[PDB]
Amino acid sequence: GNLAGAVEFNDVKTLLREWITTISDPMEEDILQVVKYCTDLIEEKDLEKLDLVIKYMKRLMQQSVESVWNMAFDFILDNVQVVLQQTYGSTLKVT
């Protein structure tokens, strides 16, 4: 739930935005953190958080000029989609 120090909803949007725009290269640990985050809120049943983090991540990875964030997002998105297909059976409409 607590990712990059950020705990609250809009606190996550702000700090993870500044994170993706400053960092030009996410390491595998950074990628796995955001997978675990977007899986945690599925286990905490906060699909409002899923809605936010998916659509807003995409925005940030496109706001970042680096294609490494696009492949990072592709892996994170993929894994978290699968988690929703097992846990709920369906995914949130957002991509």
Curated annotation (Swiss-Prot):
Tissues/organs with expression: Ubiquitous.
Entry's localization field: Nucleus
Domain of life: Eukaryota
Stretches for region Protein interaction domain: 2-93
Function in brief: Deoxycytidyl transferase involved in DNA repair. Transfers a dCMP residue from dCTP to the 3'-end of a DNA primer in a template-dependent reaction. May assist in the first step in the bypass of abasic lesions by the insertion of a nucleotide opposite the lesion. Required for normal induction of mutations by physical and chemical agents.
Domain notes: The C-terminal domain is necessary for protein interactions.
Family per record: Belongs to the DNA polymerase type-Y family.
Subunit structure of this chain's protein: Monomer. Interacts with the DNA polymerase zeta which is composed of REV3L and MAD2L2; the interaction with MAD2L2 is direct and requires that REV3L is in its closed conformation. Interacts with POLH, POLI and POLK. May bind ITGA3. Interacts with FAAP20/C1orf86.
Name used for this protein in its record: DNA repair protein REV1
Natural source organism: Homo sapiens (Human)
